[PDB]
């Protein structure tokens, strides 16, 4: 049953698939990521993400928590810099009250001040748990040094803003970004009809287009964090294509040519041109991959390296040199075909699971309002051709770079040396 994607008049994009599954899943996708804040309400989206189990106009916090746990269902919130997604899942016989709870949480929050005052300590704890690993801090630093205003806003709340986020800021953010023209309700294992009825009892009242966000501006730069870790983490990126272009497909083929994660456990990921170019010169442990993060107005593409502090320099240089070889046309067609096969297998295994399928449909909805069958994509990825890949490369090797480094950076090079 192909997703019956339908756009209600207001703008909500309802989509559904009656997979007759035992366990269904219903998610709601809003264009209300952290990029829509400014310098006055930083970290508001983090508290909004953590405030999904608060008292709503229709159900209290106790009723929501005990009612979702009574049927054994699950309510989760996933957030990127552009999008928020509130997802519930459970047995088909309880998804009516699950949609009651989820649509109450999305549409009619209360944001009581004692509840958010209790939640700010959980905000600090969640930020500490998230920054327990070096990759999260170095990607947040990389976005902060790469962009000026919009995509430079962190996913996690800054330290000074804890204790300062109020109920009025949450109410203003919800009233300015949780409108019907920025929302898609996506249901796997449910009838399309019910989605619509719940889309009129809810999701239809807030119907403006909301507050438009600012265009993200690239800045460049490098932020370094000397913290005495055993391994040096370093990300060097440049501006790339956005969501909705074939150059984004070229950049995805370029990261799967350069290396986008190991396929074999304990493998050396032999093929990765990067991994090969590092391993032919350095015998130390390392982990070199290609980073690509594309959002609807701008994208970042570059290299990500983990290495011993001492070798941190030339390893980074070796990785950079490999991309320059791809910028000089030094590539083979079999390598690009293997990269295309890796990318399409990764897409199919990403959509093979139920929650990944629901997220994909959701994203497509908010992004283009349309569903693109997995098949369609396959032929478009195939459209990307060798020269196209080379092109994206030169974009990276030329565009001003942004560098986030962390660790013992005594031998980590700078951008003017890199």
């Amino acid at each position: 049953q192909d997703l019956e994607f339908t756009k209600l008049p207001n703008g909500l994009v309802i989509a559904s698939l009656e997979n007759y599954a035992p366990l269904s899943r219903i998610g709601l996708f809003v264009k209300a990521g952290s990029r829509y804040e400014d310098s006055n309400n930083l970290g508001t989206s983090h508290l909004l993400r953590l405030a999904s189990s608060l008292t709503t106009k229709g159900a209290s916090s106790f009723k929501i928590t005990r009612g979702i746990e009574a049927v054994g269902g699950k309510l989760s919130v996933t957030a990127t810099r552009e999008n928020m997604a509130y997802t519930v899942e459970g047995i088909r016989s309880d998804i009516e009250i699950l949609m009651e709870f989820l649509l109450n949480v999305t549409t009619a929050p209360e944001f009581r001040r004692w509840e958010v005052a209790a939640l700010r300590s959980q905000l600090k704890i969640d930020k500490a748990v998230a920054f327990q690993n070096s990759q999260t801090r170095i990607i947040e630093n990389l976005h902060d040094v790469a962009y000026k205003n919009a995509l430079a806003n962190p996913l996690y709340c800054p330290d000074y803003r804890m204790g300062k986020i109020t109920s009025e800021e949450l109410h203003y953010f919800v009233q300015n970004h949780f409108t019907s023209a920025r929302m898609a309700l996506v249901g796997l294992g449910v009838s399309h009809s019910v989605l619509k009825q719940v889309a009129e009892q809810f999701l239809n009242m807030r119907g403006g287009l909301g507050l438009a966000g600012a265009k993200a501006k690239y800045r460049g730069g490098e932020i370094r964090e000397q913290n005495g870790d055993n391994l040096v983490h370093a990300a060097i990126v440049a501006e790339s294509a956005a969501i909705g272009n074939a150059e984004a497909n070229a950049f995805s083929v370029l990261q799967h040519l350069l290396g986008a994660g190991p396929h074999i456990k304990r493998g050396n990921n032999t093929t990765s041109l990067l991994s090969q170019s590092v391993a032919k010169g350095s015998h130390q442990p390392f982990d070199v991959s290609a980073f690509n993060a594309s959002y609807s107005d701008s994208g970042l593409f570059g290299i990500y390296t983990i290495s011993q502090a001492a070798a941190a320099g030339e390893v980074i240089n070796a990785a950079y040199n490999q991309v320059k070889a791809v910028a000089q046309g030094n590539l083979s067609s079999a390598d690009v075909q293997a990269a295309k096969n890796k990318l399409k297998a990764g897409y199919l295994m990403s959509v093979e699971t139920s929650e990944g399928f629901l997220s994909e449909i959701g994203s497509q909805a908010l992004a283009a309002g349309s569903y693109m069958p997995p098949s369609t994509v396959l032929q478009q990825i195939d459209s990307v051709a060798d020269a196209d890949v080379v092109k994206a490369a030169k974009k990276f090797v030329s565009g001003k770079k942004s560098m986030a480094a962390s660790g013992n950076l005594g031998h980590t090079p700078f951008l003017d040396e890199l």
């Binding site: 996933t78 690509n292 997220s359």
Partner: protein
């Protein structure tokens, strides 16, 4: 972020599960201009900075 990032995805996606090593328990002191800072500390004399 399904085909674009892949392995890098979990870095750009908070996923507070809401309902349904661990964090290790993650100061108040007693109380402009322009010039290179010069820190000062004394055996008994309180410290100071004259920037």
């Amino acid at each position: 972020v399904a085909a674009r990032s892949g392995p890098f995805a979990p870095v750009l996606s908070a996923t507070s599960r809401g309902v349904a090593g661990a964090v290790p328990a993650a100061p108040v002191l007693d109380v402009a201009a322009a010039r290179p800072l010069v820190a000062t500390v004394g055996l008994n004399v309180p410290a100071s900075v004259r920037f």
